[PDB]
Amino acid sequence: GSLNCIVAVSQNMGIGKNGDLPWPPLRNEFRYFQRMTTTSSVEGKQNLVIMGKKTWFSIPEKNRPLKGRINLVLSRELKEPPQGAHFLSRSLDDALKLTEQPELANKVDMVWIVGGSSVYKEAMNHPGHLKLFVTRIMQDFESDTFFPEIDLEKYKLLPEYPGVLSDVQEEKGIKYKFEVYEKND
C-alpha cells in the first residue's frame, strides 16, 4: 500500500535531544500523534507503527507498547523485539514484507513511520504514495538529531487536510502548525 510519516520538527529541523524531544511536552500535539497513528475505521484491524530502536526507548516505558497500534522496531543488531514491542525487522523492506505475511495479513489498516532520522530519510525515498504529517514547532530548539530536508522536486505542501487543524496552535506558550506533504512518485 502507501506509507505515512509523522514528525514534529523545530524551526532548525530538530526532532531529538538527549534521547527525548527538544521541546517540553505538548499534551495536545502528543494527542494528535496518538490520534493520527491510532485512528483506524476498519473494525478488526490496527495501524502498524514502525520506528528505530532509539525512538522506541525515547517513549516512556508506561506508554510502551503504543496502545491500540501494532509496534514494530527496526534494529540490525537485535534479534528479539525489545520488551513490550510486537515485532522486530532488520530493514524497512522486511517490515513492509511482514504486512503480507501470516503475522500481519489482514491485521494492518495503515502504516505509520514514526522512527528516527534514518527511518524517515529512507521512508521519504520509498516508491509509491507518501504523506508526511509534519508538525512545524515554530521555535528553534537545541537538538542532536534532525529531520532530513523535504525534497520539493517530489513533495508538495497540501493547503489544508481533512481531520488536521489548519490554524497555528499554541500549547505551553509554544506555537506550532500542522502540515501535510505528499508525493506521487
Ligand X SMILES: Nc1nc(=O)c2nc(CNc3ccc(C(=O)N[C@@H](CCC(=O)O)C(=O)O)cc3)cnc2[nH]1
Q: Which of 90, 129, 172, 175 binds ligand NAP (CB under 6 A)?
A: 90
For the chain, what is the largest distance between any 2 Cα atoms, rounded to a whole number of angstroms?
A: 47
Residues 15-74 that bind ligand X (CB under 6 A): 21, 29-31, 33-34, 55, 58-59, 63, 66-67
Separation of alpha carbons 104 and 45, rounded Å: 10
Instruction: Count CB neighbours of 149 within 10 A.
Output: 10
Residue 145, annotated as binding a ligand = no
State which residue, 67 or 90, has the beta carbon closest to ligand X: 67
Closest C-alpha among 154, 146, 113 to residue 6: 113
For the CB of residue 74, give the shortest distance to ligand NAP in the complex, in Å.
Answer: 4
180 contact choice in ligand X, ligand NAP, none (CB below 5 to 8 Å, kind-dependent)? none
For the CB of residue 24, give the shortest distance to ligand X in the complex, in Å.
Answer: 11
Separation of alpha carbons 85 and 22, rounded Å: 24
The one-character DSSP state at 116 is -
Residue 38, annotated as binding a ligand = no
What residues pair up with 89 in beta bridges, in sequence order?
74
State which residue, 42 or 97, has the beta carbon closest to ligand NAP: 97
Catalytic residue, chosen from 3, 21, 26, 66, is 21
Interface map 99-138 toward ligand NAP (x if CB under 6 A): ---------------xxxxxx--x----------------
Helices (H), the chain: 27-38, 53-58, 92-99, 117-125
Residue 17, annotated as binding a ligand = yes
Backbone angles phi, psi at 150, to 5 degrees: -85, 120
Separation of alpha carbons 128 and 5, rounded Å: 13
* 91 part of the interface to ligand NAP, by CB under 6 A: yes
Residue 117, annotated as binding a ligand = yes
The one-character DSSP state at 130 is E
Q: Of 39-47, 49-57, 79-87, 155-163, which part binds ligand NAP (CB under 6 A)?
A: 49-57
Write out the catalytic residue numbers. 21, 29
